[PDB]
Design a protein around this ligand. Structure first.
Ligand code: AMP
Ligand code: AMP
Lengths: 145, 153
């Protein structure tokens, strides 16, 4: 079973807990075009890298995981096996550290196509890397978003 | 069926008409890890980018070693590889600057993704990842087939 690591992160423009447009597209494309209906031939490894006094009812209302849950649901829905977890530190380094630890067959990263993370992975990950850029119609006017 | 474009080129260290170590690794890896036994779920699109008076027998040997011929022999190697395991394929040659042409071909043919080998030098693979208008899979060579000078392919 081909182990596909998918680096997933939060959106900075879409409200929380939405995944970034880039990693969502990358994830969905991978399921559409790579996994297809062959759901037992692949295993998705979802990695997200992450960087008390109460005085009124209001303070209780005010009071990474929900991201992972979005993708785990997507996998469950079409029946692909997955494992999802969080590690801490600099995302591009940690992704690479996790590639050498987990040894997935390849790494999927979205990319905003700005020329940080996706470029470093391609350069340094110790497995093949699939870089997926956003569709034109879902690319924000400012590509950095 | 997922259209997989695979950019293939000739080796400069291996005698002709051998594929480069990197694109060979790239192709074989894709068959092994992506296509697997599901040979009808994928279609391989093999692209090679290529960069008359005869006076002596030697001129005919040269012709047979031209880029055109280096090109076709290259395509035939991969088409045989596809046919052997029963994966549908299409293979052709375009002319010009390889990185530019690969990208032009991506937008013309519209494959679901592009597979390129990579020597891991930090020319072609990095340009594709940056510019191709489809997903790009970059596959580097195994340690044990990487020549002492990584520029060699
Ligand atoms: N904090 C993170 N944790 C896991 N993956 C990340 C993280 N940040 C970025 N990525 C990956 O990098 C992609 C964006 O790459 P880039 O545009 O080069 O920053 C996202 O689609 C993710 O695949
Ligand atoms: N003439 C060419 N035609 C098609 N693909 C090429 C050509 N030259 C290089 N490539 C692709 O670029 C890869 C090498 O990438 P790089 O080491 O980054 O130059 C090869 O493995 C091929 O996948």
């Amino acid at each position: 079973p081909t182990k596909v690591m998918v680096a997933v992160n939060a959106s900075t423009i879409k409200d929380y807990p939405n995944p970034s447009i880039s990693c969502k597209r990358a994830f969905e494309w991978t399921l559409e075009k790579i996994v297809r209906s062959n759901t037992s031939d692949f295993k998705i490894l979802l990695l997200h890298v992450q960087v008390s006094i109460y005085a009124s009812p209001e303070d209780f209302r005010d009071m990474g995981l929900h991201l992972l849950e979005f993708f785990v649901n997507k996998c469950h829905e079409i029946g692909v096996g997955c494992e999802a977890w969080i590690k801490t530190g600099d995302p591009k380094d940690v992704i690479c550290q996790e590639v050498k630890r987990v040894r997935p067959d390849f790494l999927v990263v979205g990319s905003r196509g700005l020329g940080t993370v996706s470029a470093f992975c391609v350069k340094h990950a110790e497995c093949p890397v699939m870089t997926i850029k956003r569709n034109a119609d879902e690319t924000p006017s400012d590509p950095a978003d």
